[PDB]
Amino acid sequence: APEDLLERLLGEMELELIELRRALAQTIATFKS
Amino acid sequence: TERQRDAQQLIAQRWYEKAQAALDRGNEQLAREALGQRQSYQSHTEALGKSLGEQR
Amino acid sequence: TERQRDAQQLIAQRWYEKAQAALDRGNEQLAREALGQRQSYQSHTEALGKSLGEQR
Amino acid sequence: ALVEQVRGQLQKLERKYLELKSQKNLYLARLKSAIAAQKIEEIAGNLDNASASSLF
Amino acid sequence: ERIETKILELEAERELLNPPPSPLDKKFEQWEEQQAVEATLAAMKARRS
Amino acid sequence: ERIETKILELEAERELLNPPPSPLDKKFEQWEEQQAVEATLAAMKARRS
């Protein structure tokens, strides 16, 4: 369904945004070191 | 959506309240920056505000 | 929640009472710090106080 | 002369070795960020003109 | 650098998917903000001065 | 230090989960406190001096 895809795609953004959240934190994880 | 507008508008009032307190005795440098902060919320106030009217 | 406000307000009065006794004969250094202590409770007094009105 | 020069090699090599490995994670941050940079906006393009938005 | 080419291989895509801010808007963002601060502070600098 | 990287691996997360106090608020926390002491003691230094 387009809605389920919209949820899943936005969910995929949620899956990736958290990955960006993890990835961006990894960037911050090294600057202080 | 309307509740968000009130919250954003209240946040703008909160920032305006801080701007109201960041203005006295010549502290315009902080107000200069602080006032700009509200305009970011005003964009939402205008952007969400106009949208709310259309949805009616 | 209202009982907490009274207790916090009484605590603020207690701190104000200590501030009232930490002020005499030029002991402003202790009052300078002591008065700041109440404002921490005042934040609760204002924060919880405003919330109580909304809940009504 | 043999022992002195070789110690400097290891120290310089190890000093260079750690710096090379030091820059590793700093750039791998851009790697996943680059992966995040594209595939995030990749889903954004799915709701533009001729996209799902045109399906809308 | 091939990753950098990959970054540019995909940064350009976002450039086409999302055109960059034109210099005209930069003037606005840099000039329209002047009133956003001046006009907003114009009332503040006269309201309760 | 890998634990320190773990600390930073998770301190950064709290940084994203909870953004750090911006310097603007630091001015307030450092300036808004000035009235919180001055204004509060302004009455004390004049009320029962």
UniProtKB/TrEMBL annotation, chains B, C:
This is Chloroplast membrane-associated 30 kD protein. Belongs to the PspA/Vipp/IM30 family. The chain holds residues 57 to 112 of 223 of the full protein. It comes from the Bacteria. It comes from Synechocystis sp. (strain ATCC 27184 / PCC 6803 / Kazusa).
TrEMBL record, chain D:
It comes from the Bacteria. ADP 3 binds at D48, N49, S53. Residues 1-56 form a coiled coil. ADP 6 binds at D48, N49, S51. ADP 5 binds at N46, N49, S51. ADP 1 binds at K21, D48, N49. ADP 2 binds at N46, D48, S51, S53. ADP 4 binds at D48, N49, S51, S53. Belongs to the PspA/Vipp/IM30 family. This is Chloroplast membrane-associated 30 kD protein. The lineage of its organism: Bacteria, Bacillati, Cyanobacteriota, Cyanophyceae, Synechococcales. The chain holds residues 113 to 168 of 223 of the full protein.
